[PDB]
Amino acid sequence: QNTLIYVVPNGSFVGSNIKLTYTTTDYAVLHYFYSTGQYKVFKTVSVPNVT
Amino acid sequence: AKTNPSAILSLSTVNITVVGLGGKASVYYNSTSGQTVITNIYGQTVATLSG
Amino acid sequence: LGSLSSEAYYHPVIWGRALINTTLIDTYASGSVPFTFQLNYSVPGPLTINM
């Protein structure tokens, strides 16, 4: 319901990623602040490279 | 820029620095002509490639 | 935003399909209370009409 698991290969566990784009539910967020490039909004999940 | 701090920001790719021993050259997508301006160490626009 | 300095300190706004929460104050009913809405919109800026 409100849980998630991402699974990935035995080597591409680093550089595994996921892209979230929350999507507008109002049409009119587009208007004149589309040129911000956050009309629909943009974030990601990631695993850092470590040594 | 002059209003909002930064977001996803776009560029006239008006240069790409390629300095060497002497002079410089550049291969720069100039988003105020709408084409690939390519310059060289002679100084001049040597090609200009549409769109 | 960075468009509004210090003149803004007064403004009620909403946009589109996005929710304005309302205050339908009411005391004069019993059982289930149905409500209808009337909204009255108008358009800042000159209005020429194409017909």
Determine whether the interchain pair B4/A37 forms a contact, defined as Cβ–Cβ distance below 8 Å. Answer: no
DSSP bridge pairs for B19: B24
What is the pairing mode between strands B35-39 and B24-30? antiparallel
C-beta separation of B27 from B16 below 8 A: yes
**Backbone φ, ψ for residue B48 (5° rounding):** -160, 110
3-state SS class at C39: coil
From B23, B26, B1, B22, select the one nearest B11 (Cα to Cα): B1
- Render the burial of A28-39: b for 16+ CB within 10 Å, e for the rest: ebeeeeeeeeee
Q: Which positions in chain A touch B8 (Cβ < 8 Å)?
A: 36-38, 42
Contacts of C14 (CB under 8 A, 6+ apart): C20
Residue in A with minimal Cα distance to B6: A36
- What is the spatial distance between Cα B2 and Cα A36, in angstroms, rounded to a whole number? 13
Place of tokens 């620095």: B17
Declared resolution, Å: 11.2
Contacts of C15 (CB under 8 A, 6+ apart): A26, A28, A29, A31
C-beta separation of B29 from B37 below 8 A: yes
